[PDB]
Amino acid sequence: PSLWKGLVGIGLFALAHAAFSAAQHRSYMRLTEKEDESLPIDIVLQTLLAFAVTCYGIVHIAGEFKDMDATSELKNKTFDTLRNHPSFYVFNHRGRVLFRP
Amino acid sequence: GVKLTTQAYCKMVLHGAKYPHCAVNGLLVAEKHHTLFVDCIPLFHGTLALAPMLEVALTLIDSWCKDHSYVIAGYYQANERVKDASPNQVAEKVASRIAEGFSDTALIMVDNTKFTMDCVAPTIHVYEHHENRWRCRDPHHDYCEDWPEAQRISASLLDSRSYETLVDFDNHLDDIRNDWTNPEINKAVLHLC
């Protein structure tokens, strides 16, 4: 139902938070002038999890497939609705008499 | 007179009212005044000038009536125009076909002008087979077993919007699980007297 929208929103928010955290960590590291290139593992895990969750959630809202067989939706069509022509309607019948003559 | 019963009249009115914009027709059976009818079976609505489905329905209904010791004796039709109440070729052909197996068969035409909500008249024209033609035997007669009860029951059924459950032979052909004997209408007319 509508839970997939919440799931994808949560995933996007988590990805944005991970981005902000990585940027802040890089800005702090450039101050201390340390050439160790220390990337925390928790940030990588968080961003990978958020990306996976977001992709899984967004794959379920793109829509639904439909059969390509042209004779698939006419299995339930009946001749009652096929003989009605809206352009040639005429209002001269007993329906007027029955209801408030 | 033919002295139509109450069930046949009520079912005929309901079938005529279910599809106001179309033309409907059915069958009348009698037990094996003059000839008392028992009930009616609605056959078709829409386009009526086609042979095969009419033949299949006639055969099935004839076999069913033969099983329960009945006989097809009447044919009722209602046109589409509000100012048209005369028989056409299809009705004459079917009535002539029926007449060869049962004498003094009836050709009933529904009159759209008198198709009022509760009742103003029996709104029925009865035609009898004289030589090779049909004549309107209408001496302002009363072609009902008891007019007041019949009109009261028909008015109550029409007011109750009970025509949404009536099923004819066309709906049976669309889906086999439907029933063209209409037990619900029989129960309703038995309870409501």
Q: How many other C-beta atoms lie within 10 A of the C-beta of residue B51?
A: 9
Q: Decide if A99 touches B, using CB distance below 8 A.
A: yes
User: Which candidate, B167, B191, B178, B153, places its Cα nearest to that of B45?
Assistant: B167
Contacts of A19 (CB under 8 A, 6+ apart): A47
Distances (CA, A) of A7 to A1, A10, A20, A48, B21: 11, 5, 20, 15, 52
- ∠A46-A47-A50 over CA atoms, to 5°? 85
State whether residue A35 is helix, strand or coil.
Answer: coil
Contacts of A98 in chain B (CB under 8 A): 17, 20, 115-117, 158
B-chain CB neighbours of A83 within 8 Å are: 46-47
Provide the terminal-to-terminal Cα distance of chain B, rounded to the nearest Å: 24
Residues of chain A in contact with residue B158, where contact means CB-CB under 8 angstroms, are 98
Top residue of A93, A96, A99 to mutate, by most chain B CBs within 10 Å, is: A93
Select from B17, B82, B113 the Cβ nearest to the Cβ of A92: B82
Of the candidates B160, B148, B163, which has an alpha carbon nearest to the alpha carbon of residue B193? Answer: B148
Residues paired with B110 in a beta bridge: B124
The CA-atom distances, in angstroms, between B164 and each of B115, B132, B167, B178 are 18, 39, 8, 13
User: Cβ–Cβ of A95/B16 closer than 8 Å?
Assistant: no
Which helix (H) or strand (E) covers residue B37, if one does? strand B37-45
**B-chain residue closest to A99, CA distance:** B117
Method: cryo-EM
Resolution (A): 3.4
Q: Is A30 on the interface with B (CB under 8 A)?
A: no
Place of tokens 């060869």: B100
Alpha carbon distance B177, B91 (integer Å):
29
First CA to last CA distance, chain A: 49
* Nearest CA among B177, B175, B155 for reference residue B13: B155
The residue assigned the tokens 């007179």 is B1
Half-sphere exposure of B94 toward its Cβ, with a 13 Å CA cutoff?
28
What is the C-alpha separation between B33 and B2, in angstroms, rounded?
Answer: 6
* Number of residues written out for chain B: 193
Task: Tell whether the torsion through CA atoms of A42, A48, A54 and A57 is positive or negative.
Answer: negative
Taking CA atoms, A88 is separated from A79, A95, B18, B117, in Å, by 17, 17, 21, 27
DSSP SS3 for A54: helix
Rounded Cα–Cα distance for residues A35 and A46 (Å)? 24
